[PDB]
Amino acid sequence: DIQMTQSPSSLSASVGDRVTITCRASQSISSYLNWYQQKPGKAPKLLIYAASSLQSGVPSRFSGSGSGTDFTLTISSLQPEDFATYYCQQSYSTPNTFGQGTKVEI
């Protein structure tokens, strides 16, 4: 029964400004965590697996860190295309369980 608090829950900032996100793992997941992004009316379109390694196109400013319990989702150059809700998922165990959503504002 794996569970993710993710804070903060709902944000707002300015173009090109550092924005930072957390998730604490009820359970140690090694590095077995994903971060999803999904603008409104769209689907989770993945930014990062195993904690950090991105995937192509994923613009330069997305930087996933941490392991075990505490992960950290820096978007450290927010731009206006980048506004949306950002999320955590373990692939660790099944059931897999999403984070519960920090929504960036531009």
CATH number at residue 88: 2.60.40.10
- Neighbour tally for 24: CB within 10 Å: 15
CA distance 2 to 65: 20
CA distance 41 to 57: 20
User: What is the secondary structure of 7-24 as a DSSP string?
Assistant: S--B----TT--EEEEEE
Domain that holds residue 41: 1-106
b/e code 89-100 from CB counts within 10 Å (16+ = b):
bbebeeeebebe
In SS3 terms, 51-85 reads as HHCCCCCCCCCEEEEEECCEEEEEECCCCCCCCCE
Residue with tokens 């295309």, as numbered in its chain = 81
Per the CB < 8 A criterion, the answer to whether 101 and 87 are in contact is yes
CA distance 64 to 35: 8
Tokens describing residue 99: 């984070």
CA distance 90 to 49: 9
CA distance 54 to 7: 21
Backbone angles phi, psi at 25, to 5 degrees: -95, 105
- Neighbour tally for 73: CB within 10 Å: 26
Q: How many structural domains are present in the chain?
A: 1
What is the largest distance, in Å, between two alpha-carbon atoms of the chain? 38
Solving technique: X-ray
Per the CB < 8 A criterion, the answer to whether 58 and 8 are in contact is no
Per the CB < 8 A criterion, the answer to whether 9 and 74 are in contact is no
